[PDB]
Write a protein that binds this ligand. Structure first.
Ligand SMILES: CSCC[C@H](NC(=O)NCc1ccc(N)cc1)C(=O)N1CCC[C@@H]1c1ccccc1SC
Length: 164
């Protein structure tokens, strides 16, 4: 079946809880595998210890820049960047998990969790999963964002891994 992975999140050192994500390996196997392996840290690098660096209320929460911590960095398990696999899944509503990018075919490790339907991103960002449990945690993260994307607390992925 499709992998289940988790992110445990703190804000200013206080635990917020766990977000559990289903990765749609049935539809986007290459994109799902990249995220799965970055969660386990099995290639020697990954998301553990990195931050949600850009959070915009009523839009999305963005994370995954584990090299530069500012939205310029990250890398995939395949190389620095990899192509857009497909655009089959859509940004249907809150809880969608999608790849951040710097234009066509520039996927690395940065990702976002939507807090609304972001249909204008369909065909531009590769959707590859959804939140199974922990939308309450995502809403807490959202509450620490701002229009500029700057967070009012330091939001850290303290642990992550694979459940099944
Ligand atoms: C129009 S701004 C460029 C798109 C933007 N990119 C980045 O935040 N960071 C650049 C980046 C660099 C390397 C990699 N691998 C991934 C992303 C991005 O992926 N996203 C995901 C949702 C939040 C943000 C975004 C998308 C569309 C419109 C606005 C925004 S944020 C104001």
């Amino acid at each position: 079946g499709n992998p289940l992975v988790y992110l445990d999140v703190d804000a200013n050192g206080k635990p917020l809880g766990r977000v559990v994500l289903e990765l749609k390996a049935d539809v986007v196997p290459k994109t799902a595998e990249n995220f799965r392996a970055l969660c386990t840290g099995e290639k020697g690098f990954g998301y553990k210890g990195s931050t949600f660096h850009r959070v915009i209320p009523s839009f999305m929460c963005q994370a995954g820049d584990f090299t530069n911590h500012n939205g310029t960095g990250g890398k995939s398990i395949y190389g620095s960047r990899f192509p857009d696999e497909n655009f089959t899944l859509k940004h249907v509503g809150p809880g969608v998990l999608s790849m951040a990018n710097a234009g066509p075919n520039t996927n690395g490790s940065q990702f976002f969790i939507c807090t609304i339907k972001t249909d204008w991103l369909d065909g531009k960002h590769v959707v590859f999963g959804h939140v199974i449990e922990g939308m309450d945690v995502v809403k807490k993260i959202e509450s620490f964002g701002s229009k500029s994307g700057r967070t009012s607390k330091k939001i850290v992925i303290t642990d992550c891994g694979q459940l099944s």
